[PDB]
């Protein structure tokens, strides 16, 4: 906290005028990058949907698959550590 509405000058949080500087840095980068800008979007595009017709749609599905795989892994991690966690996973005679 500080005795200021958000910014003042002396009293200054790790945002405030830093944020402008951060936006100014973003502008500096972005404008320098402006006569180039290809790879930036090219990479993103191809990754996302390259053909966009059961070619890039397949790529997009691959991103989904990757995601699903991670979630599956996490689920499995939080299962095999306690198979018989009062028969957590082996839900046969579901009591304990």
PDB file of N, CA and C in Angstrom:
ATOM      1  N   UNK A   1       0.837  -1.215   0.000  1.00  0.00           N
ATOM      2  CA  UNK A   1       0.000   0.000   0.000  1.00  0.00           C
ATOM      3  C   UNK A   1       0.867   1.259   0.000  1.00  0.00           C
ATOM      4  N   UNK A   2       0.270   2.401  -0.361  1.00  0.00           N
ATOM      5  CA  UNK A   2       0.920   3.702  -0.376  1.00  0.00           C
ATOM      6  C   UNK A   2      -0.149   4.797  -0.336  1.00  0.00           C
ATOM      7  N   UNK A   3       0.224   5.991   0.139  1.00  0.00           N
ATOM      8  CA  UNK A   3      -0.672   7.132   0.275  1.00  0.00           C
ATOM      9  C   UNK A   3      -0.789   7.839  -1.078  1.00  0.00           C
ATOM     10  N   UNK A   4      -1.444   7.162  -2.027  1.00  0.00           N
ATOM     11  CA  UNK A   4      -1.636   7.595  -3.400  1.00  0.00           C
ATOM     12  C   UNK A   4      -2.869   6.877  -3.958  1.00  0.00           C
ATOM     13  N   UNK A   5      -3.565   7.457  -4.951  1.00  0.00           N
ATOM     14  CA  UNK A   5      -4.714   6.832  -5.586  1.00  0.00           C
ATOM     15  C   UNK A   5      -4.306   5.542  -6.304  1.00  0.00           C
ATOM     16  N   UNK A   6      -3.155   5.571  -6.987  1.00  0.00           N
ATOM     17  CA  UNK A   6      -2.550   4.423  -7.642  1.00  0.00           C
ATOM     18  C   UNK A   6      -1.071   4.711  -7.904  1.00  0.00           C
ATOM     19  N   UNK A   7      -0.785   5.886  -8.478  1.00  0.00           N
ATOM     20  CA  UNK A   7       0.538   6.412  -8.769  1.00  0.00           C
ATOM     21  C   UNK A   7       0.613   7.846  -8.245  1.00  0.00           C
ATOM     22  N   UNK A   8       1.836   8.367  -8.089  1.00  0.00           N
ATOM     23  CA  UNK A   8       2.079   9.711  -7.588  1.00  0.00           C
ATOM     24  C   UNK A   8       3.417  10.232  -8.114  1.00  0.00           C
ATOM     25  N   UNK A   9       4.498   9.476  -7.890  1.00  0.00           N
ATOM     26  CA  UNK A   9       5.841   9.843  -8.316  1.00  0.00           C
ATOM     27  C   UNK A   9       6.842   9.183  -7.372  1.00  0.00           C
ATOM     28  N   UNK A  10       7.064   9.758  -6.174  1.00  0.00           N
ATOM     29  CA  UNK A  10       7.904   9.155  -5.147  1.00  0.00           C
ATOM     30  C   UNK A  10       7.298   7.802  -4.803  1.00  0.00           C
ATOM     31  N   UNK A  11       6.066   7.864  -4.302  1.00  0.00           N
ATOM     32  CA  UNK A  11       5.243   6.705  -4.020  1.00  0.00           C
ATOM     33  C   UNK A  11       4.834   6.125  -5.374  1.00  0.00           C
ATOM     34  N   UNK A  12       5.268   4.889  -5.639  1.00  0.00           N
ATOM     35  CA  UNK A  12       5.079   4.209  -6.908  1.00  0.00           C
ATOM     36  C   UNK A  12       5.177   2.704  -6.668  1.00  0.00           C
ATOM     37  N   UNK A  13       4.138   1.956  -7.053  1.00  0.00           N
ATOM     38  CA  UNK A  13       4.137   0.498  -6.992  1.00  0.00           C
ATOM     39  C   UNK A  13       4.796  -0.078  -8.256  1.00  0.00           C
ATOM     40  N   UNK A  14       5.197  -1.369  -8.251  1.00  0.00           N
ATOM     41  CA  UNK A  14       5.744  -2.145  -9.379  1.00  0.00           C
ATOM     42  C   UNK A  14       4.809  -2.403 -10.566  1.00  0.00           C
ATOM     43  N   UNK A  15       4.006  -1.393 -10.843  1.00  0.00           N
ATOM     44  CA  UNK A  15       3.072  -1.211 -11.933  1.00  0.00           C
ATOM     45  C   UNK A  15       3.180   0.280 -12.256  1.00  0.00           C
ATOM     46  N   UNK A  16       2.075   1.034 -12.261  1.00  0.00           N
ATOM     47  CA  UNK A  16       2.132   2.475 -12.437  1.00  0.00           C
ATOM     48  C   UNK A  16       2.862   2.833 -13.732  1.00  0.00           C
ATOM     49  N   UNK A  17       3.877   3.682 -13.619  1.00  0.00           N
ATOM     50  CA  UNK A  17       4.692   4.182 -14.708  1.00  0.00           C
ATOM     51  C   UNK A  17       5.498   3.052 -15.355  1.00  0.00           C
ATOM     52  N   UNK A  18       5.773   1.966 -14.613  1.00  0.00           N
ATOM     53  CA  UNK A  18       6.436   0.795 -15.170  1.00  0.00           C
ATOM     54  C   UNK A  18       5.622   0.229 -16.311  1.00  0.00           C
ATOM     55  N   UNK A  19       4.316   0.223 -16.102  1.00  0.00           N
ATOM     56  CA  UNK A  19       3.355  -0.297 -17.063  1.00  0.00           C
ATOM     57  C   UNK A  19       3.464   0.443 -18.392  1.00  0.00           C
ATOM     58  N   UNK A  20       3.554   1.776 -18.329  1.00  0.00           N
ATOM     59  CA  UNK A  20       3.770   2.576 -19.525  1.00  0.00           C
ATOM     60  C   UNK A  20       5.075   2.164 -20.170  1.00  0.00           C
ATOM     61  N   UNK A  21       6.153   2.091 -19.387  1.00  0.00           N
ATOM     62  CA  UNK A  21       7.453   1.665 -19.882  1.00  0.00           C
ATOM     63  C   UNK A  21       7.380   0.296 -20.545  1.00  0.00           C
ATOM     64  N   UNK A  22       6.554  -0.590 -19.992  1.00  0.00           N
ATOM     65  CA  UNK A  22       6.352  -1.925 -20.488  1.00  0.00           C
ATOM     66  C   UNK A  22       5.605  -1.898 -21.822  1.00  0.00           C
ATOM     67  N   UNK A  23       4.643  -0.981 -21.956  1.00  0.00           N
ATOM     68  CA  UNK A  23       3.875  -0.774 -23.179  1.00  0.00           C
ATOM     69  C   UNK A  23       4.748  -0.102 -24.241  1.00  0.00           C
ATOM     70  N   UNK A  24       5.626   0.802 -23.805  1.00  0.00           N
ATOM     71  CA  UNK A  24       6.580   1.520 -24.624  1.00  0.00           C
ATOM     72  C   UNK A  24       7.609   0.537 -25.188  1.00  0.00           C
ATOM     73  N   UNK A  25       8.058  -0.412 -24.358  1.00  0.00           N
ATOM     74  CA  UNK A  25       8.949  -1.490 -24.757  1.00  0.00           C
ATOM     75  C   UNK A  25       8.250  -2.393 -25.777  1.00  0.00           C
ATOM     76  N   UNK A  26       6.975  -2.725 -25.529  1.00  0.00           N
ATOM     77  CA  UNK A  26       6.154  -3.506 -26.434  1.00  0.00           C
ATOM     78  C   UNK A  26       6.080  -2.801 -27.793  1.00  0.00           C
ATOM     79  N   UNK A  27       5.829  -1.486 -27.801  1.00  0.00           N
ATOM     80  CA  UNK A  27       5.781  -0.685 -29.016  1.00  0.00           C
ATOM     81  C   UNK A  27       7.125  -0.707 -29.747  1.00  0.00           C
ATOM     82  N   UNK A  28       8.228  -0.516 -29.015  1.00  0.00           N
ATOM     83  CA  UNK A  28       9.580  -0.493 -29.561  1.00  0.00           C
ATOM     84  C   UNK A  28       9.866  -1.787 -30.315  1.00  0.00           C
ATOM     85  N   UNK A  29       9.555  -2.902 -29.654  1.00  0.00           N
ATOM     86  CA  UNK A  29       9.713  -4.238 -30.203  1.00  0.00           C
ATOM     87  C   UNK A  29       8.843  -4.404 -31.438  1.00  0.00           C
ATOM     88  N   UNK A  30       7.547  -4.144 -31.268  1.00  0.00           N
ATOM     89  CA  UNK A  30       6.527  -4.340 -32.285  1.00  0.00           C
ATOM     90  C   UNK A  30       6.833  -3.561 -33.564  1.00  0.00           C
ATOM     91  N   UNK A  31       7.298  -2.311 -33.437  1.00  0.00           N
ATOM     92  CA  UNK A  31       7.558  -1.458 -34.591  1.00  0.00           C
ATOM     93  C   UNK A  31       8.845  -1.899 -35.297  1.00  0.00           C
ATOM     94  N   UNK A  32       9.858  -2.327 -34.529  1.00  0.00           N
ATOM     95  CA  UNK A  32      11.097  -2.879 -35.064  1.00  0.00           C
ATOM     96  C   UNK A  32      10.793  -4.161 -35.851  1.00  0.00           C
ATOM     97  N   UNK A  33       9.955  -5.018 -35.264  1.00  0.00           N
ATOM     98  CA  UNK A  33       9.474  -6.281 -35.809  1.00  0.00           C
ATOM     99  C   UNK A  33       8.569  -6.101 -37.026  1.00  0.00           C
ATOM    100  N   UNK A  34       8.070  -4.877 -37.250  1.00  0.00           N
ATOM    101  CA  UNK A  34       7.123  -4.581 -38.330  1.00  0.00           C
ATOM    102  C   UNK A  34       7.434  -4.745 -39.834  1.00  0.00           C
ATOM    103  N   UNK A  35       8.684  -4.628 -40.261  1.00  0.00           N
ATOM    104  CA  UNK A  35       9.183  -4.853 -41.594  1.00  0.00           C
ATOM    105  C   UNK A  35       9.508  -6.345 -41.800  1.00  0.00           C
ATOM    106  N   UNK A  36       9.456  -7.161 -40.731  1.00  0.00           N
ATOM    107  CA  UNK A  36       9.739  -8.588 -40.743  1.00  0.00           C
ATOM    108  C   UNK A  36       8.420  -9.360 -40.748  1.00  0.00           C
ATOM    109  N   UNK A  37       7.679  -9.288 -39.629  1.00  0.00           N
ATOM    110  CA  UNK A  37       6.448  -9.990 -39.300  1.00  0.00           C
ATOM    111  C   UNK A  37       5.910 -10.892 -40.392  1.00  0.00           C
ATOM    112  N   UNK A  38       6.284 -12.135 -40.158  1.00  0.00           N
ATOM    113  CA  UNK A  38       5.907 -13.318 -40.890  1.00  0.00           C
ATOM    114  C   UNK A  38       5.840 -14.503 -39.935  1.00  0.00           C
ATOM    115  N   UNK A  39       7.006 -15.073 -39.591  1.00  0.00           N
ATOM    116  CA  UNK A  39       7.216 -16.204 -38.692  1.00  0.00           C
ATOM    117  C   UNK A  39       6.284 -16.179 -37.478  1.00  0.00           C
ATOM    118  N   UNK A  40       6.108 -14.982 -36.909  1.00  0.00           N
ATOM    119  CA  UNK A  40       5.194 -14.650 -35.829  1.00  0.00           C
ATOM    120  C   UNK A  40       3.829 -15.321 -36.017  1.00  0.00           C
ATOM    121  N   UNK A  41       3.179 -15.026 -37.147  1.00  0.00           N
ATOM    122  CA  UNK A  41       1.841 -15.466 -37.485  1.00  0.00           C
ATOM    123  C   UNK A  41       1.861 -16.769 -38.283  1.00  0.00           C
ATOM    124  N   UNK A  42       2.877 -16.975 -39.128  1.00  0.00           N
ATOM    125  CA  UNK A  42       3.072 -18.152 -39.949  1.00  0.00           C
ATOM    126  C   UNK A  42       3.110 -19.408 -39.080  1.00  0.00           C
ATOM    127  N   UNK A  43       3.946 -19.371 -38.041  1.00  0.00           N
ATOM    128  CA  UNK A  43       4.106 -20.451 -37.081  1.00  0.00           C
ATOM    129  C   UNK A  43       2.786 -20.769 -36.387  1.00  0.00           C
ATOM    130  N   UNK A  44       2.149 -19.729 -35.843  1.00  0.00           N
ATOM    131  CA  UNK A  44       0.865 -19.818 -35.163  1.00  0.00           C
ATOM    132  C   UNK A  44      -0.199 -20.441 -36.068  1.00  0.00           C
ATOM    133  N   UNK A  45      -0.246 -19.994 -37.325  1.00  0.00           N
ATOM    134  CA  UNK A  45      -1.212 -20.428 -38.321  1.00  0.00           C
ATOM    135  C   UNK A  45      -1.077 -21.918 -38.578  1.00  0.00           C
ATOM    136  N   UNK A  46       0.137 -22.325 -38.951  1.00  0.00           N
ATOM    137  CA  UNK A  46       0.438 -23.689 -39.350  1.00  0.00           C
ATOM    138  C   UNK A  46       0.106 -24.658 -38.222  1.00  0.00           C
ATOM    139  N   UNK A  47       0.572 -24.280 -37.037  1.00  0.00           N
ATOM    140  CA  UNK A  47       0.323 -24.960 -35.776  1.00  0.00           C
ATOM    141  C   UNK A  47      -1.169 -25.192 -35.560  1.00  0.00           C
ATOM    142  N   UNK A  48      -1.954 -24.121 -35.677  1.00  0.00           N
ATOM    143  CA  UNK A  48      -3.362 -24.080 -35.432  1.00  0.00           C
ATOM    144  C   UNK A  48      -4.116 -24.861 -36.512  1.00  0.00           C
ATOM    145  N   UNK A  49      -4.201 -24.286 -37.712  1.00  0.00           N
ATOM    146  CA  UNK A  49      -4.832 -24.866 -38.884  1.00  0.00           C
ATOM    147  C   UNK A  49      -4.049 -24.455 -40.130  1.00  0.00           C
ATOM    148  N   UNK A  50      -3.249 -25.381 -40.666  1.00  0.00           N
ATOM    149  CA  UNK A  50      -2.406 -25.113 -41.818  1.00  0.00           C
ATOM    150  C   UNK A  50      -3.192 -25.195 -43.125  1.00  0.00           C
ATOM    151  N   UNK A  51      -3.882 -26.318 -43.345  1.00  0.00           N
ATOM    152  CA  UNK A  51      -4.725 -26.526 -44.517  1.00  0.00           C
ATOM    153  C   UNK A  51      -6.165 -26.083 -44.256  1.00  0.00           C
ATOM    154  N   UNK A  52      -6.575 -26.141 -42.983  1.00  0.00           N
ATOM    155  CA  UNK A  52      -7.911 -25.852 -42.478  1.00  0.00           C
ATOM    156  C   UNK A  52      -8.990 -26.712 -43.146  1.00  0.00           C
ATOM    157  N   UNK A  53      -8.611 -27.886 -43.669  1.00  0.00           N
ATOM    158  CA  UNK A  53      -9.501 -28.786 -44.372  1.00  0.00           C
ATOM    159  C   UNK A  53      -9.013 -30.216 -44.153  1.00  0.00           C
ATOM    160  N   UNK A  54      -9.402 -30.806 -43.012  1.00  0.00           N
ATOM    161  CA  UNK A  54      -8.979 -32.125 -42.528  1.00  0.00           C
ATOM    162  C   UNK A  54      -7.496 -32.406 -42.765  1.00  0.00           C
ATOM    163  N   UNK A  55      -6.750 -31.341 -42.531  1.00  0.00           N
ATOM    164  CA  UNK A  55      -5.329 -31.172 -42.715  1.00  0.00           C
ATOM    165  C   UNK A  55      -4.869 -30.245 -41.600  1.00  0.00           C
ATOM    166  N   UNK A  56      -5.474 -29.057 -41.539  1.00  0.00           N
ATOM    167  CA  UNK A  56      -5.221 -28.138 -40.442  1.00  0.00           C
ATOM    168  C   UNK A  56      -6.217 -28.442 -39.336  1.00  0.00           C
ATOM    169  N   UNK A  57      -7.424 -28.895 -39.702  1.00  0.00           N
ATOM    170  CA  UNK A  57      -8.427 -29.328 -38.740  1.00  0.00           C
ATOM    171  C   UNK A  57      -7.843 -30.489 -37.936  1.00  0.00           C
ATOM    172  N   UNK A  58      -7.075 -31.360 -38.597  1.00  0.00           N
ATOM    173  CA  UNK A  58      -6.354 -32.436 -37.993  1.00  0.00           C
ATOM    174  C   UNK A  58      -5.276 -31.909 -37.052  1.00  0.00           C
ATOM    175  N   UNK A  59      -4.605 -30.821 -37.448  1.00  0.00           N
ATOM    176  CA  UNK A  59      -3.611 -30.170 -36.602  1.00  0.00           C
ATOM    177  C   UNK A  59      -4.260 -29.626 -35.329  1.00  0.00           C
ATOM    178  N   UNK A  60      -5.413 -28.969 -35.486  1.00  0.00           N
ATOM    179  CA  UNK A  60      -6.195 -28.428 -34.382  1.00  0.00           C
ATOM    180  C   UNK A  60      -6.640 -29.540 -33.430  1.00  0.00           C
ATOM    181  N   UNK A  61      -7.114 -30.654 -33.993  1.00  0.00           N
ATOM    182  CA  UNK A  61      -7.478 -31.846 -33.237  1.00  0.00           C
ATOM    183  C   UNK A  61      -6.260 -32.397 -32.493  1.00  0.00           C
ATOM    184  N   UNK A  62      -5.064 -32.300 -33.084  1.00  0.00           N
ATOM    185  CA  UNK A  62      -3.827 -32.717 -32.435  1.00  0.00           C
ATOM    186  C   UNK A  62      -3.545 -31.874 -31.188  1.00  0.00           C
ATOM    187  N   UNK A  63      -3.800 -30.565 -31.262  1.00  0.00           N
ATOM    188  CA  UNK A  63      -3.673 -29.678 -30.107  1.00  0.00           C
ATOM    189  C   UNK A  63      -4.643 -30.110 -29.007  1.00  0.00           C
ATOM    190  N   UNK A  64      -5.866 -30.468 -29.394  1.00  0.00           N
ATOM    191  CA  UNK A  64      -6.857 -30.998 -28.467  1.00  0.00           C
ATOM    192  C   UNK A  64      -6.374 -32.312 -27.843  1.00  0.00           C
ATOM    193  N   UNK A  65      -5.756 -33.173 -28.654  1.00  0.00           N
ATOM    194  CA  UNK A  65      -5.278 -34.488 -28.253  1.00  0.00           C
ATOM    195  C   UNK A  65      -4.168 -34.390 -27.221  1.00  0.00           C
ATOM    196  N   UNK A  66      -3.260 -33.463 -27.482  1.00  0.00           N
ATOM    197  CA  UNK A  66      -2.163 -33.095 -26.606  1.00  0.00           C
ATOM    198  C   UNK A  66      -2.713 -32.719 -25.237  1.00  0.00           C
ATOM    199  N   UNK A  67      -3.739 -31.873 -25.267  1.00  0.00           N
ATOM    200  CA  UNK A  67      -4.397 -31.348 -24.082  1.00  0.00           C
ATOM    201  C   UNK A  67      -5.004 -32.478 -23.259  1.00  0.00           C
ATOM    202  N   UNK A  68      -5.802 -33.295 -23.941  1.00  0.00           N
ATOM    203  CA  UNK A  68      -6.497 -34.443 -23.415  1.00  0.00           C
ATOM    204  C   UNK A  68      -5.517 -35.403 -22.763  1.00  0.00           C
ATOM    205  N   UNK A  69      -4.427 -35.688 -23.476  1.00  0.00           N
ATOM    206  CA  UNK A  69      -3.341 -36.532 -23.002  1.00  0.00           C
ATOM    207  C   UNK A  69      -2.797 -36.019 -21.668  1.00  0.00           C
ATOM    208  N   UNK A  70      -2.568 -34.705 -21.543  1.00  0.00           N
ATOM    209  CA  UNK A  70      -2.087 -34.132 -20.292  1.00  0.00           C
ATOM    210  C   UNK A  70      -3.091 -34.366 -19.166  1.00  0.00           C
ATOM    211  N   UNK A  71      -4.369 -34.087 -19.426  1.00  0.00           N
ATOM    212  CA  UNK A  71      -5.434 -34.246 -18.440  1.00  0.00           C
ATOM    213  C   UNK A  71      -5.552 -35.702 -17.985  1.00  0.00           C
ATOM    214  N   UNK A  72      -5.444 -36.626 -18.943  1.00  0.00           N
ATOM    215  CA  UNK A  72      -5.460 -38.062 -18.721  1.00  0.00           C
ATOM    216  C   UNK A  72      -4.329 -38.465 -17.788  1.00  0.00           C
ATOM    217  N   UNK A  73      -3.128 -37.969 -18.095  1.00  0.00           N
ATOM    218  CA  UNK A  73      -1.921 -38.243 -17.331  1.00  0.00           C
ATOM    219  C   UNK A  73      -2.094 -37.827 -15.872  1.00  0.00           C
ATOM    220  N   UNK A  74      -2.607 -36.612 -15.665  1.00  0.00           N
ATOM    221  CA  UNK A  74      -2.871 -36.054 -14.345  1.00  0.00           C
ATOM    222  C   UNK A  74      -3.895 -36.912 -13.598  1.00  0.00           C
ATOM    223  N   UNK A  75      -4.972 -37.296 -14.287  1.00  0.00           N
ATOM    224  CA  UNK A  75      -5.998 -38.182 -13.758  1.00  0.00           C
ATOM    225  C   UNK A  75      -5.408 -39.517 -13.300  1.00  0.00           C
ATOM    226  N   UNK A  76      -4.568 -40.128 -14.143  1.00  0.00           N
ATOM    227  CA  UNK A  76      -3.939 -41.414 -13.880  1.00  0.00           C
ATOM    228  C   UNK A  76      -2.967 -41.319 -12.709  1.00  0.00           C
ATOM    229  N   UNK A  77      -2.191 -40.232 -12.664  1.00  0.00           N
ATOM    230  CA  UNK A  77      -1.302 -39.942 -11.554  1.00  0.00           C
ATOM    231  C   UNK A  77      -2.093 -39.968 -10.251  1.00  0.00           C
ATOM    232  N   UNK A  78      -3.263 -39.325 -10.255  1.00  0.00           N
ATOM    233  CA  UNK A  78      -4.150 -39.223  -9.112  1.00  0.00           C
ATOM    234  C   UNK A  78      -5.155 -40.375  -9.110  1.00  0.00           C
ATOM    235  N   UNK A  79      -4.626 -41.598  -9.176  1.00  0.00           N
ATOM    236  CA  UNK A  79      -5.397 -42.832  -9.198  1.00  0.00           C
ATOM    237  C   UNK A  79      -4.494 -44.001  -8.806  1.00  0.00           C
ATOM    238  N   UNK A  80      -3.405 -44.198  -9.561  1.00  0.00           N
ATOM    239  CA  UNK A  80      -2.474 -45.302  -9.355  1.00  0.00           C
ATOM    240  C   UNK A  80      -1.706 -45.196  -8.031  1.00  0.00           C
ATOM    241  N   UNK A  81      -1.657 -44.003  -7.424  1.00  0.00           N
ATOM    242  CA  UNK A  81      -1.055 -43.784  -6.115  1.00  0.00           C
ATOM    243  C   UNK A  81      -1.928 -44.336  -4.978  1.00  0.00           C
ATOM    244  N   UNK A  82      -3.153 -44.791  -5.280  1.00  0.00           N
ATOM    245  CA  UNK A  82      -4.104 -45.234  -4.281  1.00  0.00           C
ATOM    246  C   UNK A  82      -5.211 -46.030  -4.959  1.00  0.00           C
ATOM    247  N   UNK A  83      -4.821 -47.112  -5.638  1.00  0.00           N
ATOM    248  CA  UNK A  83      -5.726 -48.029  -6.326  1.00  0.00           C
ATOM    249  C   UNK A  83      -6.823 -48.517  -5.366  1.00  0.00           C
ATOM    250  N   UNK A  84      -6.403 -48.922  -4.164  1.00  0.00           N
ATOM    251  CA  UNK A  84      -7.234 -49.448  -3.097  1.00  0.00           C
ATOM    252  C   UNK A  84      -7.343 -48.373  -2.004  1.00  0.00           C
ATOM    253  N   UNK A  85      -7.525 -47.099  -2.396  1.00  0.00           N
ATOM    254  CA  UNK A  85      -7.760 -45.976  -1.491  1.00  0.00           C
ATOM    255  C   UNK A  85      -9.207 -46.056  -1.020  1.00  0.00           C
ATOM    256  N   UNK A  86      -9.428 -47.088  -0.202  1.00  0.00           N
ATOM    257  CA  UNK A  86     -10.680 -47.559   0.325  1.00  0.00           C
ATOM    258  C   UNK A  86     -11.560 -47.872  -0.881  1.00  0.00           C
ATOM    259  N   UNK A  87     -10.863 -48.647  -1.681  1.00  0.00           N
ATOM    260  CA  UNK A  87     -11.078 -49.174  -2.997  1.00  0.00           C
ATOM    261  C   UNK A  87     -11.608 -48.088  -3.934  1.00  0.00           C
ATOM    262  N   UNK A  88     -10.823 -47.002  -3.921  1.00  0.00           N
ATOM    263  CA  UNK A  88     -10.957 -45.793  -4.704  1.00  0.00           C
ATOM    264  C   UNK A  88     -11.241 -46.085  -6.173  1.00  0.00           C
ATOM    265  N   UNK A  89     -10.405 -46.928  -6.780  1.00  0.00           N
ATOM    266  CA  UNK A  89     -10.438 -47.244  -8.195  1.00  0.00           C
ATOM    267  C   UNK A  89     -11.123 -48.591  -8.442  1.00  0.00           C
ATOM    268  N   UNK A  90     -10.790 -49.612  -7.639  1.00  0.00           N
ATOM    269  CA  UNK A  90     -11.409 -50.925  -7.702  1.00  0.00           C
ATOM    270  C   UNK A  90     -12.755 -50.888  -6.986  1.00  0.00           C
ATOM    271  N   UNK A  91     -13.738 -50.221  -7.604  1.00  0.00           N
ATOM    272  CA  UNK A  91     -15.065 -50.000  -7.053  1.00  0.00           C
ATOM    273  C   UNK A  91     -15.952 -51.233  -7.233  1.00  0.00           C
ATOM    274  N   UNK A  92     -15.497 -52.367  -6.692  1.00  0.00           N
ATOM    275  CA  UNK A  92     -16.243 -53.616  -6.664  1.00  0.00           C
ATOM    276  C   UNK A  92     -17.273 -53.556  -5.538  1.00  0.00           C
ATOM    277  N   UNK A  93     -16.952 -54.168  -4.390  1.00  0.00           N
ATOM    278  CA  UNK A  93     -17.772 -54.111  -3.184  1.00  0.00           C
ATOM    279  C   UNK A  93     -17.514 -52.769  -2.497  1.00  0.00           C
ATOM    280  N   UNK A  94     -17.965 -51.693  -3.154  1.00  0.00           N
ATOM    281  CA  UNK A  94     -17.763 -50.295  -2.802  1.00  0.00           C
ATOM    282  C   UNK A  94     -18.225 -49.953  -1.384  1.00  0.00           C
ATOM    283  N   UNK A  95     -17.322 -50.149  -0.418  1.00  0.00           N
ATOM    284  CA  UNK A  95     -17.477 -49.802   0.985  1.00  0.00           C
ATOM    285  C   UNK A  95     -16.131 -49.267   1.466  1.00  0.00           C
ATOM    286  N   UNK A  96     -15.126 -50.145   1.444  1.00  0.00           N
ATOM    287  CA  UNK A  96     -13.736 -49.853   1.749  1.00  0.00           C
ATOM    288  C   UNK A  96     -12.892 -51.016   1.232  1.00  0.00           C
TER     289      UNK A  96
END
